[PDB]
């Protein structure tokens, strides 16, 4: 969607969380505020948007 028309999603249990996105693109920014990017897998993020 466009920058003004940015979307929103309410992820809640389906397949797998991460370690897949760690290559989805050859080069991609992974700026994380708070949670450490390397510690993103075994946490439990309750209310998450996309």
């Amino acid at each position, epitope marked *: 969607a466009s920058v003004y028309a940015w979307n929103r999603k309410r992820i809640s249990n389906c397949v797998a969380d991460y370690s897949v996105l760690y290559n989805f693109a*050859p*080069f*991609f*920014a*992974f700026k994380c505020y708070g949670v450490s*990017p390397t510690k993103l897998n075994d946490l439990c993020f309750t209310n998450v948007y996309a």
Partner: nanobody
Amino acid sequence: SAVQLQASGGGFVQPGGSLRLSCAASGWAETFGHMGWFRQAPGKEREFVSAIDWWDTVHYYADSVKGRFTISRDNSKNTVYLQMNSLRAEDTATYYCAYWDMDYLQNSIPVDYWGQGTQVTVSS
């Protein structure tokens, strides 16, 4: 951050010759830092050469490389070049394609990521 760098090029340049290098980038990073080269003169300390902004808004040059160095990023394959004009005969060094993983370079000494050394001698 975990960033892999893909540098290639070099050869055997001559007094008054030139280089046209390349340095591709791949890997997730905390921020979009600047690519470039930290060349140590043979037996010397690692020295900043010429840094381009990731958005291609800031260019940098140094006296040891002014007039005979320039850095530019490929818009197609995202491989930042090191293309120059009339490089002198003293640059018989090994050139590391270092990686400042910061959006702005307050000082060049803290170089989060680095690259491979490019050993090019300058003689005919």
